[PDB]
Design a protein around this ligand. Structure first.
Ligand SMILES: [Zn+2]
Ligand SMILES: [Zn+2]
Length: 665
């Protein structure tokens, strides 16, 4: 199969039945184990590049591809049975993945290969493959005595149970509060109308996000915001505090047994940040540079509160409490740049946004997008596109667009890698495949689907991952697509969001759905000018969370709540409510990427450096810079370190000048 057609390069099945998913799962695991069994028994002196490295690499490709037909349906299939089977498949496959990574016999063979092998006779990416594989083995303790490995296991198995419990608690929580309409003042009728009513003249308000935020952002009754904030930040307090008290010390022990000083050092080693000290300095210096901006905003908010308390006689306490931050930050947006989102959206018909988004990217990256006519999909609402390189006709890959909310479908925005763009056994390249999964407002009444600006920003964000997935071309599957450092994966996505704050780009993405008139120059200037409203406190709040995250993985004997309170008053200027335990509701800690929360802010600094220093310098639609970004930042996927690719693109080490200049510092 050629690199100049898509024909036959994508045969992923999206209509598998629950029994077919079960069968394929059982067959994948067994057949794949046999390959590791075969590599794990090769005589150490007989280990070679073809019978070892090439064997492990070939199996990684075939395995990852079969695995996606099995673990993806749980996120998009409309059939409840199919979804459950996929979830089950993902559980068996995930346990199998752990098993294989714990194969001491296989580790031995790769360690010996790297020795007896002349690393200078093989491609740089294959050297990286070996080094990274051996490194992952050491990180799993495969070089340690059997006694120590067993200890690490009994601890990791207990840390998984703890994280699953921490999360289960928060998810199964159904705490509720009852308020009279008087107590929910200022809240929209659309909000109140959707609330359940009790046998009293009261409305039920849960603690789930859809209820919590509009109440913290719009409720003009201070005491209501107060009770919500108290109840919301006390969820699972006992249970999860108890879990954290066991979990963090466990993370410390495991790190020690592995040879690291702290769990943080363990996590950060695989990131571009590299170490605990580097992250601490990153966050510490940022909050210092941001301090003055936080003092002004905090001051501005204070003048708004004191003033409003007099115009309603609520009483003033001279301070910004936790249950006041969102509220006054919203008031700020309405006074600085009154941007009516429900009005603006009318200028963003999904049809127009989609066409615009794709047009921009085709021109910027030298690509051509063509929709697949009668494409095999998991839902009639999904469209499939084939991606060719404008110049050569080369088919880089395909991407699916799943844009509307649907029962059973993943409810958050994301980009899934379905097929890696790596080499196949005969040297031919596997076509990359990605699925963009978002949930944009569907067409209501006679009006088409209309996107708010933040949704247009999400569309671009996710499409940034799609392009990373599709343009990434490596020799090995493990370095393909978005397999870059965790604190680097959000670089491609956040850099592309800059385009939705670009006047000229916005013109290409909007047209009033009715008469089709463009957005007024006056409104455009206002929209882009409001990009940084409240950036001070917002960023400081992100730094607070980032510090808590590092702290809980640098220590152990630490009280999560007090640590959070400490940074809240020291960095944010808004005290943490006495009696609450935000960290115990911090889903990021347990499951996920603990010790890496700073990653998002870390990535913004870099994306901002590239956008300003390169695209702004040369013109953000300049094809030359566009191609360099694709070739130097996207194309290599994870086959090169993040900082090296940044250097390659910038032609100097990255720095935060741009990130600070934008913020206005
Ligand atoms: Zn021991
Ligand atoms: Zn992202």
């Amino acid at each position: 199969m050629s690199s100049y057609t898509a024909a036959g390069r994508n045969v992923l099945r999206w209509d598998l039945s629950p029994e077919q998913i079960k069968t394929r799962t059982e067959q994948l695991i067994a057949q794949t184990k046999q390959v590791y069994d075969t590599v794990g028994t090769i005589a150490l002196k007989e280990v070679t590049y073809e019978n070892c490295l090439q064997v492990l690499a070939d199996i990684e490709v075939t395995y990852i591809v079969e695995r996606t037909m099995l673990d993806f349906p749980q996120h998009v299939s409309s059939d409840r049975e199919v979804r459950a089977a996929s979830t089950e498949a993902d559980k068996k496959l995930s346990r199998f993945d752990i098993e294989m990574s714990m194969r001491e016999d296989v580790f031995q063979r790769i360690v010996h290969l790297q020795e007896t092998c002349d690393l200078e006779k093989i491609k740089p990416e294959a050297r990286r493959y070996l080094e990274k594989s051996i490194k992952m083995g050491k990180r799993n303790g495969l070089h340690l005595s059997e006694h120590i490995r067993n200890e690490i296991k009994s601890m990791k198995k207990r840390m998984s149970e703890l994280c699953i419990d921490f999360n289960k608690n928060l998810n199964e929580d159904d705490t509720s509060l009852v308020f009279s309409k008087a107590e929910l003042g200022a809240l929209p009728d659309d909000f109140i109308d959707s609330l359940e009513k009790t046998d009293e003249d009261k409305y039920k308000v849960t603690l789930k996000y859809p209820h919590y935020f509009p109440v913290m952002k719009k409720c003009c009754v201070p005491e209501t915001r107060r009770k919500m904030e108290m109840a919301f930040h006390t969820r699972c307090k006992q249970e999860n505090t108890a879990i954290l008290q066991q979990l963090l010390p466990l993370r410390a022990q495991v790190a020690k047994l592995l040879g690291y000083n702290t769990h943080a050092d363990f996590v950060l080693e695989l990131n571009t940040a590299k170490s605990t000290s580097r992250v601490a300095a990153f966050l510490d210096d940022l909050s210092q540079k941001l301090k003055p901006l936080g003092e002004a905003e905090r001051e501005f908010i204070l003048s708004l509160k004191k003033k409003e308390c007099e115009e309603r006689g609520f009483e003033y306490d001279g301070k910004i409490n936790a249950w006041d931050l969102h509220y006054y930050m919203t008031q700020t947006e309405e006074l600085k740049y009154s941007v009516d989102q429900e009005s603006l959206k009318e200028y963003f018909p999904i049809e127009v946004v989609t066409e615009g988004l794709l047009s921009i990217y085709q021109e910027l990256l030298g690509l051509s997008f063509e929709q697949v006519p009668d494409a095999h999909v998991w839902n009639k609402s999904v469209s499939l596109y084939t991606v060719k390189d404008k110049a050569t006709g080369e088919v880089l890959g395909q991407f699916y667009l799943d844009l509307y909310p649907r029962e059973g479908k993943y409810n958050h925005a994301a980009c899934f890698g379905l097929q890696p763009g790596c080499l196949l056994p005969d040297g031919s390249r596997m076509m990359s495949v990605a699925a963009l999964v978002v949930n944009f407002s569907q067409p209501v009444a006679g009006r088409p689907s209309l996107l708010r600006h933040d949704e247009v920003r999400t569309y671009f964000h996710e499409f940034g991952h799609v392009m990373h997935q599709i343009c990434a071309q490596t020799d090995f599957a493990r370095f393909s697509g978005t397999n870059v450092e965790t604190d680097f994966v959000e670089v491609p996505s956040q850099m592309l969001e800059n385009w939705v704050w670009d006047v000229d780009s916005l013109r290409k993405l909007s047209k009033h759905y009715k008469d089709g008139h463009p957005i007024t120059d006056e409104l455009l200037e206002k929209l882009v000018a409001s990009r940084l409203v409240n950036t001070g406190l917002l960023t400081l709040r992100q730094i607070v969370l980032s510090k808590v995250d590092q702290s809980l993985h640098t220590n152990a004997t630490l009280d999560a709540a007090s640590e959070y309170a400490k940074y809240c008053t020291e960095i944010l200027g808004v005290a943490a409510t006495p009696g609450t335990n935000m960290p115990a509701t911090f889903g990021h800690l347990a499951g996920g990427y603990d010790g890496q929360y700073y990653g998002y802010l870390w990535s913004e600094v870099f994306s901002m450096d590239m956008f300003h220093s390169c695209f702004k310098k040369e013109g953000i639609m300049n094809p030359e810079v566009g191609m360099k970004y694709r070739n130097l930042i996207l194309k290599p996927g994870g086959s090169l370190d993040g900082m090296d690719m940044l250097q390659n693109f910038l032609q100097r080490e990255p720095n935060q000048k741009a990130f600070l200049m934008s913020r206005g510092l």
